[PDB]
């Protein structure tokens, strides 16, 4: 199953549902007892996250899913300085 993530400027990012569960914020929107139709929600609009940041975030999902149990060389995650601060805002707003 795939879920859909809309950025602040309207860009649509479709990632695997299992990967999007990395974010703590996204997890509470997509999983739970089902009282609020979380297990039937497959689309999330982020007014808070621009597209160039949300694109980095979605890579981070697929990056954390592969190199999580492999004790092989964990590859460096490129974070350009211009995006550096802005990406921490999205990561704090999402993770945990």
């Amino acid at each position: 199953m795939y879920v859909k993530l809309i950025s602040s400027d309207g860009h649509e990012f479709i990632v695997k549902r299992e990967h999007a569960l990395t974010s703590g914020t996204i997890k509470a929107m997509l999983s739970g007892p089902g009282q609020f139709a979380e297990n039937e929600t497959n689309e999330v609009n982020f007014r808070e996250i621009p597209s160039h940041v949300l694109s980095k975030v979605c890579m981070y999902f697929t990056y954390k899913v592969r190199y999580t149990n492999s004790s092989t060389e964990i590859p460096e995650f490129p974070i350009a300085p211009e995006i550096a601060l802005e990406l921490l805002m999205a990561a704090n707003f999402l993770d945990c």
Binding site: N69, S70, S71, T72
Partner: protein, 155 residues
């Protein structure tokens, strides 16, 4: 035990592969005929050490005479190094706990070339034998995060 799953992946303990080629490093500058005698006498001599290096790394399985060296929880055995089984070869056995994963290492060295091979094996008995199930408390501390837990101080 969840340790069996952590064995399935490749190179769970760094620099060590599930199968690997080993050499007898030692007296690298001396002639080969002298090395074959140095390694053969070392396995037989009563207070001699033999070590084998995994090729491409600086990681080594060090075999010690029990009467001259000890360790916290390592238990001496007489059959970990066996020569007189097969003429021209020497087999090796090494039980140890690597990253909370109980393993058994088995390998051999050719007496004329001083080269060999070996691979790891799972020891599900030692996992049951290890008490208090602190190996699952160990794995907890390995997955913990400290990056934002300390409380700031402004003075």
């Amino acid at each position: 035990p969840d340790q069996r799953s952590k064995f399935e992946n490749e190179e769970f303990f760094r620099k060590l592969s599930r199968e690997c080629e080993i050499k007898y490093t030692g007296f690298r500058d001396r002639p080969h005929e002298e090395r074959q005698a140095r390694f053969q006498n070392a396995c037989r001599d009563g207070r001699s050490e033999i070590a084998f290096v995994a090729t491409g790394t600086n990681l080594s399985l060090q075999f010690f005479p029990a009467s001259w060296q000890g360790e916290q929880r390592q238990t001496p055995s007489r059959e970990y190094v066996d020569l007189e089984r097969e003429a021209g070869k020497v087999y090796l056995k090494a039980p140890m706990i690597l990253n909370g994963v109980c393993v058994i290492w088995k390998g051999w060295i050719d007496l004329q070339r001083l080269d060999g091979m070996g691979c790891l094996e799972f020891d599900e008995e030692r996992a049951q034998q290890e008490d208090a199930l602190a190996q699952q408390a160990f794995e907890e501390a390995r997955r913990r995060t400290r990056e934002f837990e300390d409380r700031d101080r402004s003075h």
